[PDB]
Design a protein around this nucleic acid. Sequence first.
RNA 1: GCGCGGGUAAGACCGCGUGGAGGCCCGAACCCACUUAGGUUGAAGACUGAGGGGAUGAGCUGUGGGUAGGGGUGAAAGGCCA
RNA 2: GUGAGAACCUUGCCCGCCGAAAGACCAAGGGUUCCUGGGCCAGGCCAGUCCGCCCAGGGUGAGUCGGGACCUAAGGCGAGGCCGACAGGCGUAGUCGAUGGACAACGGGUUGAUAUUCCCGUACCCGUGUAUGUGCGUCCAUGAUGGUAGUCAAGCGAUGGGGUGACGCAGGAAGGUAGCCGUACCGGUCAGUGGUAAUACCGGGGUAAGCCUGUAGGGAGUCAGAUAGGUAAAUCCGUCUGGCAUAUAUCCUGAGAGGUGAUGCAUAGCCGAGUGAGGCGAAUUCGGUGAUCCUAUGCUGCCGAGAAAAGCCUCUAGCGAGGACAUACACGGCCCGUACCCCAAACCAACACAGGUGGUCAGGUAGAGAAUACUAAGGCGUACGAGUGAACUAUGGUUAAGGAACUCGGCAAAAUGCCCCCGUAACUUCGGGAGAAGGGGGACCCACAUGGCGUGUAAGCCUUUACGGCCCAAGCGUGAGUGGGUGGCACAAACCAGUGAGAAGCGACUGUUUACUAAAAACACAGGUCCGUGCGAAGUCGCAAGACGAUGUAUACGGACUGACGCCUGCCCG
RNA 3: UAUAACCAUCCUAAGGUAGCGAAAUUCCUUGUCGGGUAAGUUCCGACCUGCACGAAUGGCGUAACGACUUCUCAACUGUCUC
RNA 4: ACAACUUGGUAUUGGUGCUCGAUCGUAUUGGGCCUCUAACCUCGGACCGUAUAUCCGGUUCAGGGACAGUGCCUGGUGGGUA
Lengths: 46, 275
Amino acid sequence: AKGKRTFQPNNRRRARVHGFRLRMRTRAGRAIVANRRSKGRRALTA
Amino acid sequence: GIRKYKPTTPGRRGASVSDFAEITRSTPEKSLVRPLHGKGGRNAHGRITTRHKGGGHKRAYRVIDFRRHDKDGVNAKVAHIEYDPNRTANIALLHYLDGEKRYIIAPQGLKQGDVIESGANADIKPGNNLPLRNIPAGTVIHAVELRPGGGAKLARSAGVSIQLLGKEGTYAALRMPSGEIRRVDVRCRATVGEVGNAEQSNINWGKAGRMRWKGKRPTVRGVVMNPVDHPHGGGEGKTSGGRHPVSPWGKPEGRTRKPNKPSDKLIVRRRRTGK
RNA sequence: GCGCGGGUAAGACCGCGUGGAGGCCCGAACCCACUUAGGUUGAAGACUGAGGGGAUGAGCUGUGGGUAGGGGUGAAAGGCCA
RNA sequence: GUGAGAACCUUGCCCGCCGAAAGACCAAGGGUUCCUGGGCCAGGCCAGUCCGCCCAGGGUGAGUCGGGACCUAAGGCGAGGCCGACAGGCGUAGUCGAUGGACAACGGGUUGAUAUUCCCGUACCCGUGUAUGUGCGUCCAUGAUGGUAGUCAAGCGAUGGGGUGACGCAGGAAGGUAGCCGUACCGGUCAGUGGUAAUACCGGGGUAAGCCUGUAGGGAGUCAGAUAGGUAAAUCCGUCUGGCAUAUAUCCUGAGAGGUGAUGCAUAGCCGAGUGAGGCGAAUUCGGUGAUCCUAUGCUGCCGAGAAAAGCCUCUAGCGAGGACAUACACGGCCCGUACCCCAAACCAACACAGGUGGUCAGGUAGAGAAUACUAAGGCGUACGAGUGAACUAUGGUUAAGGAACUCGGCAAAAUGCCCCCGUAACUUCGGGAGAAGGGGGACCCACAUGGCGUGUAAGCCUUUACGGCCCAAGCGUGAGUGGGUGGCACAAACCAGUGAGAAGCGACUGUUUACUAAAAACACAGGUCCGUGCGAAGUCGCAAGACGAUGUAUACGGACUGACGCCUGCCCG
RNA sequence: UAUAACCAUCCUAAGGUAGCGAAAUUCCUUGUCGGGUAAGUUCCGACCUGCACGAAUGGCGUAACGACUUCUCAACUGUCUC
RNA sequence: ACAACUUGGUAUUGGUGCUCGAUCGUAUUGGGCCUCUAACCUCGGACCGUAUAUCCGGUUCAGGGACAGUGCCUGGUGGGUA
Ligand SMILES: [Mg+2]
Ligand SMILES: [Mg+2]
Ligand SMILES: [Mg+2]
Ligand SMILES: [Mg+2]
Ligand SMILES: [Mg+2]
Ligand SMILES: [Mg+2]
Ligand SMILES: [Mg+2]
Ligand SMILES: [Mg+2]
Ligand SMILES: [Mg+2]
Ligand SMILES: [Mg+2]
Ligand SMILES: [Mg+2]
Ligand SMILES: [Mg+2]
Ligand SMILES: [Mg+2]
Ligand SMILES: [Mg+2]
Ligand SMILES: [Mg+2]
Ligand SMILES: [Mg+2]
Ligand SMILES: [Mg+2]
Ligand SMILES: [Mg+2]
Ligand SMILES: [Mg+2]
Ligand SMILES: [Mg+2]
Ligand SMILES: [Mg+2]
Ligand SMILES: [Mg+2]
Ligand SMILES: [Mg+2]
Ligand SMILES: [Mg+2]
Ligand SMILES: [Mg+2]
Ligand SMILES: [Mg+2]
Ligand SMILES: [Mg+2]
Ligand SMILES: [Mg+2]
Ligand SMILES: [Mg+2]
Ligand SMILES: [Mg+2]
Ligand SMILES: [Mg+2]
Ligand SMILES: [Mg+2]
Ligand SMILES: [Mg+2]
Ligand SMILES: [Mg+2]
Ligand SMILES: [Mg+2]
Ligand SMILES: [Mg+2]
Ligand SMILES: [Mg+2]
Ligand SMILES: [Mg+2]
Ligand SMILES: [Mg+2]
Ligand SMILES: [Mg+2]
Ligand SMILES: [Mg+2]
Ligand SMILES: [Mg+2]
Ligand SMILES: [Mg+2]
Ligand SMILES: [Mg+2]
Ligand SMILES: [Mg+2]
Ligand SMILES: [Mg+2]
Ligand SMILES: [Mg+2]
Ligand SMILES: [Mg+2]
Ligand SMILES: [Mg+2]
Ligand SMILES: [Mg+2]
Ligand SMILES: [Mg+2]
Ligand SMILES: [Mg+2]
Ligand SMILES: [Mg+2]
Ligand SMILES: [Mg+2]
Ligand SMILES: [Mg+2]
Ligand SMILES: [Mg+2]
Ligand SMILES: [Mg+2]
Ligand SMILES: [Mg+2]
Ligand SMILES: [Mg+2]
Ligand SMILES: [Mg+2]
Ligand SMILES: [Mg+2]
Ligand SMILES: [Mg+2]
Ligand SMILES: [Mg+2]
Ligand SMILES: [Mg+2]
Ligand SMILES: [Mg+2]
Ligand SMILES: [Mg+2]
Ligand SMILES: [Mg+2]
Ligand SMILES: [Mg+2]
Ligand SMILES: [Mg+2]
Ligand SMILES: [Mg+2]
Ligand SMILES: [Mg+2]
Ligand SMILES: [Mg+2]
Ligand SMILES: [Mg+2]
Ligand SMILES: [Mg+2]
Ligand SMILES: [Mg+2]
Ligand SMILES: [Mg+2]
Ligand SMILES: [Mg+2]
Ligand SMILES: [Mg+2]
Ligand SMILES: [Mg+2]
Ligand SMILES: [Mg+2]
Ligand SMILES: [Mg+2]
Ligand SMILES: [Mg+2]
Ligand SMILES: [Mg+2]
Ligand SMILES: [Mg+2]
Ligand SMILES: [Mg+2]
Ligand SMILES: [Mg+2]
Ligand SMILES: [Mg+2]
Ligand SMILES: [Mg+2]
Ligand SMILES: [Mg+2]
Ligand SMILES: [Mg+2]
Ligand SMILES: [Mg+2]
Ligand SMILES: [Mg+2]
Ligand SMILES: [Mg+2]
Ligand SMILES: [Mg+2]
Ligand SMILES: [Mg+2]
Ligand SMILES: [Mg+2]
Ligand SMILES: [Mg+2]
Ligand SMILES: [Mg+2]
Ligand SMILES: [Mg+2]
Ligand SMILES: [Mg+2]
Ligand SMILES: [Mg+2]
Ligand SMILES: [Mg+2]
Ligand SMILES: [Mg+2]
Ligand SMILES: [Mg+2]
Ligand SMILES: [Mg+2]
Ligand SMILES: [Mg+2]
Ligand SMILES: [Mg+2]
Ligand SMILES: [Mg+2]
Ligand SMILES: [Mg+2]
Ligand SMILES: [Mg+2]
Ligand SMILES: [Mg+2]
Ligand SMILES: [Mg+2]
Ligand SMILES: [Mg+2]
Ligand SMILES: [Mg+2]
Ligand SMILES: [Mg+2]
């Protein structure tokens, strides 16, 4: 009787996987944040 | 000793276990143990380096002394024989006269309450050490050093032995456990005797858990494998693979020693199977 | 294995009390999905009602970590990778 | 009763349901759903005075609870550096990273919303100041010496050394405690019926941490000399010579019991007084049953053989003339989390959904039970209704005689089902096959019978006399057997609760697989043979360093085919 | 009367040792013989005429085990006449 | 076609000795073999950068050694990949 779905929330996991420090640690992250800023999104990175 | 189970459940029939009539304690010295972690058979990259190796049980490593030249000319006493999973054979605890404690492999036939000489001019008592230059011919040795100051890096498993042939200049001839003959500088160190617990061979396990605890994973045969992931795979029914056996990666059997190795033009001869 | 009474010269062996080794047995939770009736513009984008196998183990599960696409993983079915 | 409207809102009285939850809580998860006050054009599958609707205001109180300032793992970053055409991949020193280790508070009361946070009462752990008392040296000088002279043992004491800290699986016995069931004892009731007036019935029959004592039990060895092993030195840890020791010696630990905390708090009840508050306020002795909780990191067995750092103790190296102890007085003790929802209308599922969600609490009667049936504490009647012997559909219930004659198919149903006694085949790898089939008994009362058994007090015996060991009238609980009698169709009466046998084929067994049509004769599984590997191996990932194999060394490791065990495994090298 | 149960002809490398056989292999096939009820194209035990069994892509057995497949027996019942 | 493996030449690349030939002693410049150390190599031992370092670098001791590896050209195997 399994109904467990894909989404299992957790703030710690979400932050450390899609966090700013992780994003800017590398280069592609910097490029994508720059692209998003050029676009003009309200929130840069989740 | 060897003990054989009386069959009472289908899985256990024919099982056996080694009777540990040689142990005296079950607690290593707190100052000589060092930790170890379950490893999983991967590497830094995370790729599976060797298939079907993993799982098992948590083990604690104990340090051993394979140098045995820092201390010389000082006697020692045999204290106890201890359990050790990390290596096939058993081990012994030594009490040096000056008070230091050290660990070595337990040679065959040794027992509690004995005297071991580690001098460069020591006796021929088993368990002693002294340079190859000073060992008489015809004796059996183990823990051979591949070269001076290199540590015993050969013949460490249970039941192995090395036989010493004649000598020449700075070179000596050794009979390899597998029949080979190799030459090595006499300046190196070695130990007299052979590794005990020669009954390792007769152990019959008969149970999946006794292998899983050691960490052996299934093998999955080749023919059943699908054609994409394997060279024998495919075919309706079951067949020999439609091609002469080849490794699962494209390269067949045969020569395996890299030629022109620095030892290639110095070492004598190769093995012969089943003479 | 142990102690007692037999058998022996010693045994094997014969009975008597303790021990609970068992990938042992019946049976809850949990986990699995074999048969069967319903649902099928369903309550549910793969369930429910009866029955069905393990239950000291190759067991079940929480916590934090690693494995990236001609690649990963895979007790190996051309499965899985939101 | 409210209001214009009421089966769906408020009060009161009946009835039913749940109760290993349809109850009380934690972490994760959401953010204002919590309270007060306003209304009902939006929403609630219908109307709504109601709301998890919205409006406005209010509400979250820690030296001791969870985290940070304390320490670490699998892993991530990475100064130098290596390798790489560039971009970039590695990894040292270090710093990050709880699901762990250490670490100091409990009972009761309080408002519409807060409680180990406020108050009452009593505790514990770190720091600073003042005063006082023990009181030792710097400057005198006795001492021990290696005995004129040079050091010194006070007091601190490490970034250093050494101990401790520091670890698996299964299992019973013994002594305890919680919980529960009776009872001495204390307060209250006269329940419109045939009979019981207190020998009946109803309700009570409580109360923490710390501080004192140290019972049962368990564990452990101590002094003299030599020494040089522990990256220097060591009175420390080791090793070697001798003495001391089986003493319940000595030390440590330590359940439970006992006193203190408590002239206190709370409560059954009695008075007035009702959205409710105030005042007063009894007795609080003895037995049985008995844990999943304590002694316990105990003890006994087993192999597959079982984290680190910090802290604490100690040692010197080294600083050193003020410091140590005790008492009293007066002070300081940092940052974040703190409402509400938690087995769900507030989380995951597009919904106010028949699914899922880690952990803690576990009453009575029958019961082996945490299954099953009715029930206390506690919570619910969950959001469309009222009527009406159509067929038909779905879930149950019953049915003569035949019983498998339909159906590819004994599919579904039906049947046995529990406890105690008698005896159980062909087989066999001697464990098993085996609960094999079958037959008999199962209520109540009395007598045997004040029988027996366990516990256990009055009382007795004994002693290293104390919190002591033995028996144990009385009291309490409890099955087994033999006779006689009684009722009915039925004596495991409900619920719950295995069909069995005889063959063949396939697979040795337990196991795993196509989430979402296939659970197998499929897959692996322990046995064997061959091939390859001489050690920064072969085999790998990676154009490279490097990493695995292995902190291992052919009685091992990688690849291939086969699959327990028995009888075996023919010919042929083009 | 039944056929080869020895020798030689071609070829290449030799031309199936044990064991089993209308089977998870068999088109002609519901092959022939004995068992089973009244009826047996299923099943069981044998017959060798092996299209196209066969010993490490193993053969023949085998105690115990199987939500594996096929057949028979007693009890049962609304699976049926109904 | 490519990766990978593999064969020679050539540069890295040094000294001295035996042995085979094209204008039986006279002339031929390249092959085969044995030696020596300074190039080069060793996840060998010991010290220092260093208080903590199995990284790294340097000195020294000890072994290999003109090989191996690696640049450039080239001959072969090559469903491992396109
Ligand atoms: Mg270690
Ligand atoms: Mg990559
Ligand atoms: Mg493998
Ligand atoms: Mg694991
Ligand atoms: Mg060993
Ligand atoms: Mg086994
Ligand atoms: Mg395999
Ligand atoms: Mg397969
Ligand atoms: Mg292919
Ligand atoms: Mg793939
Ligand atoms: Mg195939
Ligand atoms: Mg085929
Ligand atoms: Mg095959
Ligand atoms: Mg091949
Ligand atoms: Mg070999
Ligand atoms: Mg037992
Ligand atoms: Mg059963
Ligand atoms: Mg519906
Ligand atoms: Mg969907
Ligand atoms: Mg279902
Ligand atoms: Mg179900
Ligand atoms: Mg059914
Ligand atoms: Mg079940
Ligand atoms: Mg079953
Ligand atoms: Mg079982
Ligand atoms: Mg299992
Ligand atoms: Mg990624
Ligand atoms: Mg398949
Ligand atoms: Mg998918
Ligand atoms: Mg109403
Ligand atoms: Mg219920
Ligand atoms: Mg319950
Ligand atoms: Mg339940
Ligand atoms: Mg949460
Ligand atoms: Mg939160
Ligand atoms: Mg509210
Ligand atoms: Mg309102
Ligand atoms: Mg409205
Ligand atoms: Mg609406
Ligand atoms: Mg509002
Ligand atoms: Mg606070
Ligand atoms: Mg690092
Ligand atoms: Mg840097
Ligand atoms: Mg790094
Ligand atoms: Mg960290
Ligand atoms: Mg943590
Ligand atoms: Mg509170
Ligand atoms: Mg263990
Ligand atoms: Mg244990
Ligand atoms: Mg009461
Ligand atoms: Mg206490
Ligand atoms: Mg000494
Ligand atoms: Mg218990
Ligand atoms: Mg303070
Ligand atoms: Mg804060
Ligand atoms: Mg709260
Ligand atoms: Mg809340
Ligand atoms: Mg809340
Ligand atoms: Mg809830
Ligand atoms: Mg939603
Ligand atoms: Mg709903
Ligand atoms: Mg739901
Ligand atoms: Mg769950
Ligand atoms: Mg329970
Ligand atoms: Mg009920
Ligand atoms: Mg309730
Ligand atoms: Mg109908
Ligand atoms: Mg029906
Ligand atoms: Mg009837
Ligand atoms: Mg009938
Ligand atoms: Mg018919
Ligand atoms: Mg039919
Ligand atoms: Mg059925
Ligand atoms: Mg049978
Ligand atoms: Mg039997
Ligand atoms: Mg039976
Ligand atoms: Mg007395
Ligand atoms: Mg006594
Ligand atoms: Mg009757
Ligand atoms: Mg067969
Ligand atoms: Mg099974
Ligand atoms: Mg399987
Ligand atoms: Mg699957
Ligand atoms: Mg499927
Ligand atoms: Mg599925
Ligand atoms: Mg299926
Ligand atoms: Mg399956
Ligand atoms: Mg199967
Ligand atoms: Mg299988
Ligand atoms: Mg074999
Ligand atoms: Mg094997
Ligand atoms: Mg092999
Ligand atoms: Mg290699
Ligand atoms: Mg093999
Ligand atoms: Mg087979
Ligand atoms: Mg097979
Ligand atoms: Mg041949
Ligand atoms: Mg040939
Ligand atoms: Mg046949
Ligand atoms: Mg067969
Ligand atoms: Mg045929
Ligand atoms: Mg046929
Ligand atoms: Mg036939
Ligand atoms: Mg039929
Ligand atoms: Mg064929
Ligand atoms: Mg074969
Ligand atoms: Mg063969
Ligand atoms: Mg069989
Ligand atoms: Mg029949
Ligand atoms: Mg009937
Ligand atoms: Mg060249
Ligand atoms: Mg060259
Ligand atoms: Mg040049
Ligand atoms: Mg080609
Ligand atoms: Mg292709």
